[PDB]
Assembly symmetry: D2
Homo-oligomer: 262 residues x 4
């Protein structure tokens, strides 16, 4: 009855119980998956938000800008799931951009240092996580990252749009590497979801508002910006065996908004 | 406990046991779905092939160019699944293009009457099946059609490519209509699979120039696909379609899912 | 001096002086092109309108659904431009969709016979025109058709959207053929322009939603958009007819103010 | 008579006379444009090379990673074209990626500092150059960047593919900014051309065969002129409704699977 039955999956990116990662985790566990979680910085609070998941799961520290964490990550994951076991799934649900690269801050005024930090964490880290975790993944496995359609420019998102454009490209190359291990690599492009990070993006509020209302309007089946579950289920679909021929790709979990002009 | 358990699903397009629709049907039954089948022309022969499926399934006649078949379709489906029951799934796995519109035949020499028949059967019928069946579909339901990536031109496929481009555009509009029934509409873009249709194009008149190009095309899929592509295995495609028939892609509509080994994401 | 100096170019699609084709012809003539025009159905009326262009141009009858018109087109064009001369450019600026395939008419209620006539005129005719004219075109020549971005679905445009998706695909195959003659094939995807065909998309609400798209277009466009000025689109078509886009084929150039590149 | 007659256009990225920017500059001058050129690193050699252009032109130093070069750029440009005169066109023909992010070097072994430098020079600089130069550009003006279609992954191009993907995203936001000045921003995605940087990536003639094949009108790696003319097209008044966009000067190869 479990879609992810018997699969060992690493899930990064939980910060609150609003986090897309948190809901990915909950739905995965409901579908029989065995998880390992990773958190950044506030492991104290995170450890406790994750206590509210349907089942218990080891929590490892991972700062994707930290070379030492990455070098040790595979070892620490192995310790947590038991030697002789490998990952079946990896969820990258990590993103960051300094305030200067978002909101009403002029596009031209974000210093490259700030952009580079945003691109490091939001795009490059998809590959560096892949580099760490592929040596301990089973054939038939699946890596899934979170995307926000960057095909067109828009207000407020600014340099985070550029980061997602890089991430989409990095994804297609990770797929080439991941293919050597019989592993898939894909992105899920979600509609706007009210999260902690969503909260930080913000005149700029007027625009975000109008964008959101637009999404629900264009989407032929509507879009509930307060429900993370359909996005969570999409990510789990990709972690399962039921999309076995899809890789280097992007699945849109956006109510179909991107397929409609008006 | 099965992916499609308790779902009632119509599956069109079986003609041989190599048909993509045959494998869609088999995997759906393995996952607990209850099927209605539609078939065109050689119904006696199709019943023998559908007899090979794991589970029983009623076989209705449907020529998508027949207005009466389409007008009577919903009523014949209702009769087969019992009144008060609706469908949760529809699979469109139907294609046709006259020989003039494909293969070694010069692109410019396909008469429009031929092209128009191909587009009717291959693209327009997705809308008219949706029109006939949406009134007997449940919310949360899902329509799926079969695609072959037409974003770039290529040898041989010729006017079928134009048909598929039209199909993709039709799908985005079918999704607006289906939206009102709480129903999703998507396409699955498959890599090449060895079916009646496909072998017919290579074996076709090819044994000439288009022959080598087609084979070069086919062998390129496996080469570009980061995880490989096996033309003799339709199951990765059937599963993907089942994934769209299920509740596990609930926020995807008007869209295309690529079941091609990731080949379309790679230039070499 | 002129961008199209010495080029001989066929332009289809003029019905009124609001026609995109009319403005293409004008700018082409201002830039030194010698034109052959083709018109459908109302030829005496069309001559009255093409009289208003800066220069003379033979007017041929061409109904793209008429195999005999296509069969004779090359011969007739060759007589208009004189012995030893060939075409350098062809403009397809032709479209049609019956009222069932557009506006507030339900998408599902359009019979295939109507949809098929629309696709015949709007997409397939691109290929049969290239078929007719490629044998009398010069290496380095250019064929251009008019497009409206169909990558996403939208209110009112309906089955014409499907026709344009077909056209884009046909263009990529026409480029394969044209390339055997050294000829380019491309489309121009224009933003909304106030023409006769545009008038007919609604009826008597579709009119509302079209105004809504209209207003959103100028908004989305980083350089804005004026639906009453065909000239930027005309210039774009002339750019492709010229030698200044010599490595572009089977492709689409967007003359839409950049609107398609912006979400909001 | 000339397509760019009387327009003032800045062209960056010349390093040898095979540079795509060299040929952009040559064709632009042949079309009556008045140029300002910028150069990186080998200024003395570059000067030697721009002497081979059809007309003389001011050479200014610009390392796009140098905040002071960027801060002074507009002033130095106005000094060259004379106060009261503004630019009509800007050409960005600049890129770089460390050898760890390219070739047969494993994708996963390129350190972020290497990737970050490449993105800085190849993607961010398009924005930062526009920020410097938009305040001194005329309405009707045109900014043009060089692209290599990154919509699909491929061998060897590796992390530069990612840079190009970012560049395409950046171009779309620059267009938002440039619209306020009545200025357009677009990219030219070119087919492969035999340049110095092309040489740095390492079959090199095996690549020319494939492209030429797929291109319905063929493709010559030894000829940058069709790419130059395209850029000059975007600099002209003849594509006045195109912005935030990409024009493919690749022989049509990206429209074809085989
Ligand atoms: N919420 C949306 O609408 C939406 C839409 C599309 C895509 N996304 C993407 O989904 C992913 C998750 O974002 P979210 O919406 O759930 O917000 P979130 O704030 O809940 O999660 C962001 C996560 O990034 C992590 N982060 C920042 N720096 C990190 C670092 N050095 N190392 C490890 N983790 C770090 C945070 O700890 C945090 O857990 C992101 O990639 C986001 O861009 C979100
Ligand atoms: N085989 C491949 O490699 C491949 C790849 C991508 C997409 N597709 C698409 O998959 C779908 C099925 O094709 P296939 O490969 O399984 O071959 P197929 O020959 O088994 O399927 C074709 C089906 O369409 C039906 N058909 C033709 N005319 C019809 C009509 N008037 N009414 C109803 N049905 C009609 C046939 O009866 C037949 O069952 C098609 O849409 C095809 O274009 C196939
Ligand atoms: N107006 C816009 O906003 C817009 C935008 C994008 C693309 N387009 C396209 O531009 C092209 C020209 O359309 P328009 O906007 O100038 O309107 P239009 O009404 O002026 O042009 C339509 C033309 O198609 C011709 N036509 C119809 N049936 C024909 C047939 N059998 N044979 C030959 N010609 C036939 C008409 O005679 C007429 O000259 C069309 O392809 C249109 O789809 C228009
Ligand atoms: N040659 C091709 O096949 C091809 C194809 C498509 C796109 N492009 C792009 O065209 C543009 C020109 O490349 P090219 O092939 O002519 O190679 P090139 O080596 O001749 O020119 C590249 C330029 O980048 C400049 N560069 C590197 N770092 C710089 C810095 N800090 N500041 C300023 N300039 C710097 C070099 O000085 C050099 O002039 C590039 O953007 C390239 O990515 C090239
Ligand atoms: C125009 C604004 C877009 C609408 C909301 C969608 C969204 C919300 C949150 C996202 O996560 C981040 C955004 C910026 C920086 C960091 C993160 C994790 C994110 O990547 C996308
Ligand atoms: C030229 C490239 C070779 C690979 C094509 C793969 C393929 C195979 C069969 C397909 O189905 C049809 C194709 C044409 C006509 C009818 C059908 C069902 C189809 O649509 C696609
Ligand atoms: C909601 C959509 C409204 C904006 C569309 C702009 C437009 C205007 C006219 C066009 O030409 C035709 C449209 C339909 C049928 C025939 C033609 C030539 C055309 O193809 C596009
Ligand atoms: C994988 C196929 C081979 C690619 C050939 C085309 C090309 C050649 C040179 C290019 O310029 C650069 C490439 C890398 C780093 C820096 C520059 C300027 C460039 O961006 C693109
Ligand atoms: Na070729």
């Amino acid at each position: 009855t479990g879609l992810l039955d018997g699969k060992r999956i690493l899930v990064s990116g939980i910060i609150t119980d609003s986090s897309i990662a948190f809901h990915i985790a909950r739905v995965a566990q409901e579908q029989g998956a065995q998880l390992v979680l990773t958190g950044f910085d506030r492991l104290r609070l995170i450890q406790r938000i994750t206590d509210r998941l349907p089942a218990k799961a080891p929590l490892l520290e991972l700062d994707v800008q930290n070379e030492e964490h990455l070098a040790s990550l595979a070892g620490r994951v192995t310790e947590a799931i038991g030697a002789g076991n490998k990952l079946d799934g990896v969820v990258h649900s990590i993103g960051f951009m300094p305030q200067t690269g978002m909101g009403i801050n002029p596009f031209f005024d974000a210093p490259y240092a700030d952009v580079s930090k945003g691109i490091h964490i939001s795009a490059y880290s998809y590959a560096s996580m892949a580099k760490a975790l592929l040596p301990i993944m089973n054939p038939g496995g699946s890596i899934v990252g979170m995307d926000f359609d960057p095909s067109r420019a828009m207000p407020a998102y600014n340099w985070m749009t550029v980061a997602k454009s890089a991430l989409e490209s990095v994804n297609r190359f990770v797929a080439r590497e991941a293919g050597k291990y019989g592993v898939r690599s894909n992105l899920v492009a979600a509609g706007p979801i009210r999260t902690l990070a969503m909260s930080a993006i913000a005149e700029a509020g007027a625009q975000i508002q109008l964008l959101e209302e637009g999404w629900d309007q264009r989407a032929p089946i509507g879009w509930n910006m307060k429900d993370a579950t359909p996005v969570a289920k999409t990510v789990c679909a990709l972690l399962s065996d039921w999309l076995p021929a899809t890789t280097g790709d992007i699945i849109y979990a956006d109510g179909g908004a991107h397929t409609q002009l008006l």
